[PDB]
Amino acid sequence: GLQQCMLVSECSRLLTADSVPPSDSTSILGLDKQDLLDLLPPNMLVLWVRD
Amino acid sequence: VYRELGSIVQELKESGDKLEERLTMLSDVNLLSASKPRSNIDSKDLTSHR
Amino acid sequence: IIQESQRLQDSIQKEVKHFSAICLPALLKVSTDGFNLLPSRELSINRMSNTHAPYYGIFKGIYESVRLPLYKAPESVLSHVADMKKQLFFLRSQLSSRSEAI
Amino acid sequence: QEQIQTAEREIVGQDLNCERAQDLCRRSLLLRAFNKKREEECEALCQSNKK
Amino acid sequence: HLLRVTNKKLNHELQSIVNGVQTLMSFFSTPETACELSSQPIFLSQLLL
């Protein structure tokens, strides 16, 4: 759970070049932050891991 | 029949365009692996110049 | 349709091949002045952070040449070199004084 | 002191940076997310073929 | 390996669409040459007036 949370976070950041919304910037592999958040373990497991 | 075929062509075209855009992005030289560090100090490397 | 379908032929494989060639850390861009996004690996403070960083081998060599320990923070390199220059000036002055005294 | 310095050089040399394994994990996750998106796109073309 | 499978699936679906559309268009092509007995007109514009 912890490894997966860190990995998702690391990869989310790879995608979010904090750059300026350009409404037009082509993401790597066409992936958005939301596509990665879906690969997170179930919310009950994430809270358990953080506690 | 004409409207239906027209929709399929549009979907394929949009997908094709988006793919070309992504390929262009991935081919950027700055993203491509560890080119052997440059022998010359880049003008943007202020610390090495200093 | 034939033309557009041909454009999308092996589209997944083509993209994966281009992706496999990219350096992921080059994607991590940080803004130091709020305006210019630079890859974190190009930051001067990270030149010694990882053995795999592009400039690690070069700066390792510079640290050893100026006798600066590898565990020291990268921000100390210029201050240290400045002190070494100061020492050189002092040694020259001492030599000149001693040569005059002799 | 000479022994300690040799041992120190060895520890510094062993500084296990599992960066390669981590890179592979990041790539794997990104590609998994990519695969999921491409599966959705395949399902959409399948629907068009049925029509 | 998963992406290679998915890629084959996507290529198959794209080919299916190409084959499907070609088949569909074969129904609209007027057999110029009288001779071929076989292709019974399916569209009133085909004529038969």
Q: DSSP letter string over chain C? A: -HHHHHHTTTHHHHHHHHHHTB-GGGG-EEESSSS-EEEGGGSGGGTTT-TTSTTHHHHHHHHHHTT--TTS-GGGHHHHHHHHHHHHHHHHHHHHHHHHH-
Which residue type is seen at B20? Answer: E
Note whether A14 and C40 are within 8 A (CB): no
> Of C8, C61, C88, A28, which is closest to residue E12 (Cα–Cα)?
C8
CA angle C91, C95, C99 (to 5 degrees): 175
> Of C74, D35, D46, A11, which is closest to residue B47 (Cα–Cα)?
C74
How far A27 CA lies from chain B's nearest CA (Å)? 7
Residues 6 or more apart in contact with residue B30 via CB below 8 angstroms:
C26, C39
Q: Which residues of C lie closer than 8 Å to A, measured between beta carbons? A: 15, 19, 22, 24, 27-31, 37
Compute and round to an integer the Cα radius of gyration of chain A. 13
Contact E10 C8 (CB under 8 A): yes
Which residue type is seen at C6? Answer: Q
As a whole number of angstroms, the distance between CA C19 and CA A21 comes to 23
Asked how this structure was determined, the answer is cryo-EM
As a whole number of angstroms, the distance between CA C45 and CA C56 comes to 11
Contact E21 B1 (CB under 8 A): no
Note whether D23 and C24 are within 8 A (CB): yes
